[PDB]
Amino acid sequence: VYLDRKLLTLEDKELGSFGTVKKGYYQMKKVVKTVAVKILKPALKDELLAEANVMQQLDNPYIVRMIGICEAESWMLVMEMAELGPLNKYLQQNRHVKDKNIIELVHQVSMGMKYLEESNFVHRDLAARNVLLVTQHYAKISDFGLSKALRADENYYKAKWPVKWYAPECINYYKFSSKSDVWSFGVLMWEAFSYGQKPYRGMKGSEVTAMLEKGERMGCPAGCPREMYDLMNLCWTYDVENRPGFAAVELRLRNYYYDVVNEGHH
Ligand SMILES: C[C@H]1CCCN1c1cccc(Nc2cc(-c3ccccc3)nn3ccnc23)n1
């Protein structure tokens, strides 16, 4: 888990700006591995350790792999690089990405979330900005800074918040479950099919709450298939008990994805 600083080489330029994100390379047994490095500016240190503790436990093709942590100039979290970056920024700059391709990527996120649910972790920050692209056809989930391992005896974690991605039970009762992540996943779907547009544009958190409480939901994105909008709305089931889990969500996406693939060949 504790990486050797002399095996780590950071690039001069910054990828983004907790602190900074930098591209680097970590010298392995034989090969060199391209990495993304989260570099911190007591609370921030503990947050990074807890984050690393979560990632260390996760083993799945659709989740970003942590290489390890390094303590030098600053505290550093070293991850397998996902070269194409955040999904929302990518779709913003690539507006001709095909509908089938969007379905493929969100289905991959649901597979990752299915695993996370089975592992009894709640993500708590599941948004398009936190999906990273390895390729145009390969997405992984990242940013486990708010993530929690659920207690053996409870199906929820009791708590700035990303309010526009949060389910009503999160807002009203501070309770976060895998079902709460399903709600965020609906918002993520909406973002993806809207090519990385922000959800609830021009609205305050309080107005979002008021809107949802009135039974209103965001409209169907341009060119988004009815079946995928139907799934979004199902993810936005107000009552947690009646909201689907990720096993059901992933199945719906898997089946629909296979249908569209058959349409393409035909
Ligand atoms: C840095 C972001 C934002 C602007 C563009 N930019 C780009 C661009 C290309 C690739 C990446 N990759 C990665 C970024 C972050 C990360 C970590 C912390 C915060 C944000 C992102 N984590 N990570 C783990 C694996 N791969 C990445 N980011």
UniProtKB/Swiss-Prot annotation:
Phosphothreonine: residues carrying this PTM: 20, 209
Domain Protein kinase positions: 9-258
Compartment(s) of residence: Cell membrane; Cytoplasm, Cytosol
Catalytic-site annotation from UniProt: 125
PTM remark: Ubiquitinated by CBLB after BCR activation; which promotes proteasomal degradation. Autophosphorylated. Phosphorylated on tyrosine residues by LYN following receptors engagement. Phosphorylated on tyrosine residues in response to IL15.
Tissue-wise expression: Widely expressed in hematopoietic cells (at protein level). Expressed in neutrophils (at protein level). Within the B-cell compartment, expressed from pro- and pre-B cells to plasma cells.
Binding site for ATP: 15-21, 38
Residues carrying Phosphotyrosine: 2, 115, 138, 156-157, 173, 256-258
Modified residues (Phosphoserine): 17, 206
Similarity remark: Belongs to the protein kinase superfamily. Tyr protein kinase family. SYK/ZAP-70 subfamily.
Free-text function comment from the UniProt entry: Non-receptor tyrosine kinase which mediates signal transduction downstream of a variety of transmembrane receptors including classical immunoreceptors like the B-cell receptor (BCR). Regulates several biological processes including innate and adaptive immunity, cell adhesion, osteoclast maturation, platelet activation and vascular development. Assembles into signaling complexes with activated receptors at the plasma membrane via interaction between its SH2 domains and the receptor tyrosine-phosphorylated ITAM domains.
Disease: Immunodeficiency 82 with systemic inflammation: An autosomal dominant immunologic disorder with onset in early childhood. It is characterized by recurrent infections with various organisms, and multi-organ inflammation that manifests as colitis, hepatitis, arthritis and dermatitis. Patients have a propensity for the development of lymphoma, usually in adulthood. Disease severity is variable.
Domains: entry comment: The SH2 domains mediate the interaction of SYK with the phosphorylated ITAM domains of transmembrane proteins. Some proteins like CLEC1B have a partial ITAM domain (also called hemITAM) containing a single YxxL motif. The interaction with SYK requires CLEC1B homodimerization.
Subunit structure: Interacts with LYN; phosphorylates SYK. Interacts with RHOH (phosphorylated); regulates mast cells activation. Interacts with NFAM1 (phosphorylated); probably involved in BCR signaling. Interacts with VAV1 (via SH2 domain); phosphorylates VAV1 upon BCR activation. Interacts with GAB2 (phosphorylated); probably involved in IgE Fc receptor signaling. Interacts (via its SH2 domains) with CD79A (via its phosphorylated ITAM domain); the interaction stimulates SYK autophosphorylation and activation. Interacts with FCRL3. (Microbial infection) Interacts with Epstein-Barr virus LMP2A.
Protein name as it appears in the record: Tyrosine-protein kinase SYK
Name of the encoding gene: SYK
